[PDB]
Ligand SMILES: CC(=O)N[C@H]1[C@H](O[C@@H]2[C@H](O[C@]3(C(=O)O)C[C@H](O)[C@@H](NC(C)=O)[C@H]([C@H](O)[C@H](O)CO)O3)[C@@H](O)[C@H](O[C@H]3[C@H](O)[C@@H](O)[C@H](O)O[C@@H]3CO)O[C@@H]2CO)O[C@H](CO)[C@H](O)[C@@H]1O[C@@H]1O[C@H](CO)[C@H](O)[C@H](O[C@]2(C(=O)O)C[C@H](O)[C@@H](NC(C)=O)[C@H]([C@H](O)[C@H](O)CO)O2)[C@H]1O
């Protein structure tokens with residue numbers, strides 16, 4: 541559907557599946573996986589060369605074409621902040637006779653550049669904050685779309701318009717060059733980039749059509765982690781509350797309950813960056829109740845304490861609208877429920893999930909949703925179950941502020957702190 | 958039996 545290049549994984553390779561049959565040469569330094577993600581590193585053979593079908597390039601003067609892809613750009617090093625902010629490097633290039641387009645990164649900025657044969661140049665970029673307690677962009681998969689017509693170059697992020705440059709002063713742009721995927725410029729040996737679903741269209745895509753591609757390419761039967769990667773069974777995870785972004789869970793001292801604490805922040809002295817620590821709190825693990833965690837699966841939410849796997853329970857007969865959850869050894873007990881069904885109540889794209897307690901894998905009764913609540917101690921916030929959430933999650937549009945919304949944070953080389 | 962001590966604490970906590 542107006543698609544002229546469609547890079548996709550196949551047989552430990554990336555191949556153009558557009559139907560136009562371009563040649564794609566992936567060199568040995570490119571890391572691949574069957575989830576369609578590919579990784580560009582600093583090494584020289586870490587590259588992809590694409591040789592276009594010379595019959596279906598973009599129009600050099602009307603400039604009617606679009607580029608879409610997902611990207612995951614690692615966090616800055618706390619001690620490489622000035623190189624991060626200042627070094628620009630190219631990630632993807634399509635140039636012939638010093639004309640064409642390129643995609644560049646400069647720290648927290650992603651840049652689109654057009655160059656006409658006359659040598660005239662125009663750019664448009666997207667930039668994200670590097671001071672946020674919790675950023676939705678740093679080290680997390682997000683969707684980029686660049687569109688061009690004769691007058692404007694635009695960047696959409698996650699289906700929404702972010703930037704807009706007039707490109708009227710741009711004349712003829714040569715269209716038929718090889719597309720080169722490669723980090724190019726002054727970069728660190730540890731600098732890398734993840735990408736997926738790279739596509740080129742011979743049309744200016746509309747926001748409506750882009751917002752749809754974002755939804756379609758966001759959809760999966762499985763859940764995702766904080767970074768946007770698949771959520772897995774048998775993997776250690778930190779827990780994030782999308783309703784309480786700055787809070788984390790700690791097992792209360794010598795007590796089988798989860799207290800909620802405030803995340804520690806970047807405390808060094810640089811005035812360019814700020815963040816909250818992500819690698820803190822209890823370390824959890826998802827177990828099946830009988831690979832990838834799928835919506836509606838039945839699970840156990842466990843965690844590690846005293847070199848042992850403990851479990852998260854709810855008291856069967858709690859009276860109030862909410863109650864503290866019981867965090868305790870794995871045990872048979874008729875006073876507690878252990879069965880959780882994992883949910884995604886949001887209809888829009890998200891990395892949040894919800895955790896519903898039930899009697900078993902057959903029952904239709906719903907006990908409550910795992911969340912956060914302030915308890916009478918002076919008050920104190922605890923890790924809780926709640927039936928209050930059960931009606932709130934019915935509300936449209938989905939309420940993002942509900943503390944029943946969780947994300948799972950595994951360690952990742954793109955996030956150091 | 959250590960578990961029982963934990964359960965007892967839990968019931969303190971919610972009462
Ligand atoms: C504030 C509160 O604790 N709400 C709890 C409510 O308590 C009742 C009173 O509350 C309000 C309220 O804000 O909800 C006041 C409103 O005016 C009511 N609205 C009306 C009348 O239209 C509303 C209630 O929801 C009712 O459902 C409707 O009546 O209640 C509270 O003021 C009152 O207070 C005490 C009083 O202050 C004490 O001094 C005195 O001793 O006693 C009275 C009561 O004894 O108590 C009221 C009940 O007695 O009770 C309902 C139960 O129906 C809920 O418990 C509600 O608490 C919410 O609990 C859920 C879990 O079930 C969550 O834990 C909520 O906290 C979190 C969350 O995780 O979701 C933390 C997040 O930070 C916050 N997210 C952010 C930052 O975005 C979210 C919250 O979801 C979002 O803020 C929006 O959804 O909340 C917790 O608030």
Ligand SMILES: [Cl-]
Nearest residue numbers: 674676782785
């Ligand atoms: Cl978030």
